[PDB]
Amino acid sequence: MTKQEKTALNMARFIRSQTLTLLEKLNELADAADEQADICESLHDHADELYRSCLARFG
Amino acid sequence: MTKQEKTALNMARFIRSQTLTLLEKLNELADAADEQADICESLHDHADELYRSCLARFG
């Protein structure tokens, strides 16, 4: 991979992990963050899809 | 807002900014990251929607 590709891939990994952490936090807030947790569940799946796509293309 | 809500809101802001940075990086790679940039454009819009939702609910 190029160095520029590696930066992007590392950032995609980081975003996937951050979105999981946020999902956990929103889930822990229960009813007080219910709709937000549902949006974040989708967000995390989308971050995972991006990471996988980068890995397959660059790697 | 609660302190737990503030943590979540701050994290949602951070993720929105990180996804924009990644989008810029993927766009700069042009054809070499085209599909990934298209996924990331959607990802950033979804992060913006999450942030806005948290802000309106917690704030």
UniProtKB/Swiss-Prot annotation, chains A, B:
InterPro entries: Regulatory_Rop (IPR000769), Rop-like_sf (IPR035962). Antiparallel homodimer. One of its GO terms (molecular function) is identical protein binding. The keyword Hydrolase does not apply. Pfam families: Rop. The gene is rop. This is Regulatory protein rop. Keywords: Plasmid, Transcription, Transcription regulation. The keyword Glycosyltransferase does not apply. It comes from the Bacteria. Regulates plasmid DNA replication by modulating the initiation of transcription of the primer RNA precursor. Processing of the precursor of the primer, RNAII, is inhibited by hydrogen bonding of RNAII to its complementary sequence in RNAI. ROP increases the affinity of RNAI for RNAII and thus decreases the rate of replication initiation events.
